[PDB]
Every structure is written in C-alpha cells, then in structure tokens.
Amino acid sequence: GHWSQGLKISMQDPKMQVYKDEQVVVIKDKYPKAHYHWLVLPWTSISSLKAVAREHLELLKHMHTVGEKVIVDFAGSSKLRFRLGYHAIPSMSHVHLHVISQDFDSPCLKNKKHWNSFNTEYFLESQAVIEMVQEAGRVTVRDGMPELLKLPLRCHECQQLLPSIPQLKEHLRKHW
DNA sequence: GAATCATAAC
Ligand SMILES: Nc1ncnc2c1ncn2[C@@H]1O[C@H](COP(=O)(O)O)[C@@H](O)[C@H]1O
Ligand SMILES: [Zn+2]
C-alpha cells in the first residue's frame, strides 16, 4: 500500500499493461520524463541491483530485448533516440528497466535531480549491467551516487552547461 | 519576481 509499492500495483492492472509475456510486463511511467517513457518489470521481482546474480542474466537480457521491441512497436514514427537503463539508487521498489526517449520534453521533468538521474552515471546502461552480471555474477554500483544528482545541468546532446531547468528546456529546442 | 533548495508528509 505504500507509495513505494506503486509499480507492483500498476503492473497488475490490466489497463496499465502496455505489453506482457511469460517473463516481464511493460507499463508507462506514470510521471514520464520524456515523450516516451516505459518501465519494464519482471513478474518475479528483483529486490535491488545488489541482489542481482548470474541466475538473473537471462532475465536482464530479456528485459532489454522487450524494451527494444516496445520502442519499435510503439515509437516507430518518432525517430527519437532511446536509452535503456537502471537507476543506481531507486525510490520505487522492484527493480525496473527505464526505456526513455532522449527528447526529455515533459512537464514531469521538473528539477535537477530528474535531469541527472537520466544524464549521469546514476543512470546505469542496461547493456553495461548485463555485461557486469555476465562477467562477475553481480552488479557493482559505485559509491557517491547522491552527489551525482546535484551536478550542474549539462545538455546531453552538446554538453553545454545551463543554469536552470527553464533555460535547459529552452536550450533543448535547438536539438529538435 | 522566478527558480532552487531543504525539509516534511501523522
Ligand atoms: N504507480 C506508478 N506507475 C508507474 N510509474 C510510476 C508509478 N509511481 C512512480 N512511477 C515512476 O517510476 C519511476 C521510479 O523512479 P526510480 O525508483 O528512481 O526508478 C519514476 O520515473 C516515476 O515517474
Ligand atoms: Zn545542447
């Protein structure tokens, strides 16, 4: 019932399921940080990245392939670039893969923490995580994630530094 | 005046 269990409730709601198969389910991010923003969750929950082991390798690969399928099935006309990844220190329970388009045009993207959670090392690429599991049997999340969320705003396309969220949103129009 | 930061949510 906690706010932090929200993903489990949503993924069980038939009207919220964008796609589902034997292993995973896709829901829209309720507070999307870009035009296209999905979350991929396994039916068998993973508590956290620390609990990930070599036994999850195939599932993590399946979550990745399902994310890419959803892009094709639902975002083909946009021509947007996408990234797939995990937040190093999530707030919502149940490990979930972010699948998010790189326009970052959304009213829900409101503050520096939002921006840096998709545009610093706090965002762990899905491919990088799969390789970590495939090679070490575990996901290593490096120390100091909270500080990355406070970094000054930097455009992800041209690396220009911006002083505020409104000016960043205005700057992003140059990359239409 | 606008935007951000720090803190709480019973
Ligand atoms: N009930 C919900 N259904 C879908 N997405 C949600 C829900 N509650 C929160 N979210 C999103 O889930 C993500 C949780 O962030 P994080 O824990 O950092 O991976 C955020 O991007 C939220 O916008
Ligand atoms: Zn730029």
Residue numbers in the entry: 165 to 340
Show me the paper's own sentences about this structure.
The APTX RNA‐DNA deadenylase protects genome integrity and corrects abortive DNA ligation arising during ribonucleotide excision repair and base excision DNA repair, and APTX human mutations cause the neurodegenerative disorder ataxia with oculomotor ataxia 1 (AOA1). The aprataxin (APTX) RNA/DNA polynucleotide deadenylase directly reverses 5′‐AMP damage (Ahel et al, 2006; Harris et al, 2009; Reynolds et al, 2009; Tumbale et al, 2011, 2014) and associates with DNA repair scaffolds XRCC1 (Cherry et al, 2015) and XRCC4. Environmental and metabolic sources of DNA damage prompt “abortive ligation”, the failure of ligase to complete step 3, and generation of 5′‐adenylated (5′‐AMP) DNA strand breaks (Ahel et al, 2006; Andres et al, 2015; Schellenberg et al, 2015). AOA1 mutations map to the APTX catalytic domain (Barbot et al, 2001; Moreira et al, 2001; Shimazaki et al, 2002; Le Ber et al, 2003; Tranchant et al, 2003; Criscuolo et al, 2004, 2005; Ito et al, 2005; Mosesso et al, 2005; Baba et al, 2007; Yokoseki et al, 2011) and cause variable age of disease onset.
For five amenable variants (V263G, H201Q, S242N, R199H, and L248M), we successfully crystallized and determined X‐ray structures of mutant proteins as ternary complexes with RNA‐DNA and AMP. R199H: Arg199 forms a salt bridge with Asp269, as well as participates in cation‐π interactions with Trp340. The structure of the mutant reveals these interactions are lost in R199H. Trp340 shifts away from the protein core by 2.1 Å and the surrounding region of the Znf (α6) shifts ~0.5 Å away from the HIT domain. This suggests R199H destabilizes the HIT‐Znf domain interface and explains the observed APTX stability (ΔTm = −6.7°C) and catalytic (14‐ to 18‐fold reduced) defects. Intriguingly, the effect of this mutation propagates up into the region affected by S242N (α2–β4), and Ser242 makes an additional hydrogen bond to the carbonyl of Ala239. Thus, we hypothesize that by altering a common region of APTX these mutations may also affect a putative protein binding surface of currently unknown function.
